[PDB]
Symmetry: C4
Subunit: 88 residues, 4 copies
């Protein structure tokens, strides 16, 4: 279950953070790697979508702790583009 | 008619606002939830598209009252990505 | 030929400008209306794509006159999203 | 192999840079031209995707040298939109 383990790893990493550029960088990276996972054919679409949603939830929570509103909208936009990218 | 009722609720909320980050946050949230509505299979595409257009119209009107041009373009971009997201 | 006439009208409007927020606003509006043209079924995809390209060329030229680099990238991104929006 | 030669030309250009707005401008331009390559029917999708990935890797490396984080996220977003644009 590569998608859920990647989401797991990235959620773990991100929860530790008290910097917002750092957490944003990591969230977008995790989303990139979630999309890369599907493109190579190594997990089904539904699994990647689940991972994206869980990672994004955690990342947006952290960002809201640090008050990083701009970054929150930026990650949501990227999440929506990533979401489109996965469904072919 | 879940889409129109969600658009209705969000239009109602947003019209009350005199803050631009608040109205922007709410518009994008409503658009997220409009897209989420379809993904679960709980309303047809045409209905969600209508809701997105009506919500976006109201939100952009409010934002123009408060002079929030940056946010206006940001919501339009998100509206277009959401629109793509709905049509599979 | 609704697409080319809309592009024509908007190119005409935009060439007159010496403000960059104004020209950007108008370019994005023209692109919105170009996409709206297709959605209603009132011109073929190829025609709208042509109009988008010509309008975007003119708008980016004007913006470069005024040195509005941020807006240029923003219009290009919106142009690419609009382009995706048209091809279903 | 038009895609790889375009990526090659642009990678060559970009490696020379010590300005971040310049390298960003060039990366996005190369990605535009990579997408334009496919639309005219002059290279297969897989080739353009390879070129986009290699160009983006180099550009993001340069940008990280110059500390241009905002531009990095902007190029990644554009890379994802370009990627969607290529797969029809
Ligand atoms: Zn990305
Ligand atoms: Zn969203
Ligand atoms: Zn638009
Ligand atoms: Zn572009």
């Amino acid at each position: 279950m590569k998608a859920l383990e990647l989401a797991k790893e990235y959620i773990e990493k991100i929860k530790k953070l008290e910097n917002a550029e750092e957490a944003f960088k990591l969230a977008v990276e995790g989303l990139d790697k979630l999309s890369e996972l599907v493109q190579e054919g190594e997990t089904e679409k539904e699994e990647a979508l689940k991972g994206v949603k869980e990672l994004v939830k955690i990342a947006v929570e952290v960002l809201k702790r640090l008050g990083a509103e701009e970054e929150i909208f930026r990650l949501d936009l990227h999440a929506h583009i990533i979401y489109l990218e996965i469904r072919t």
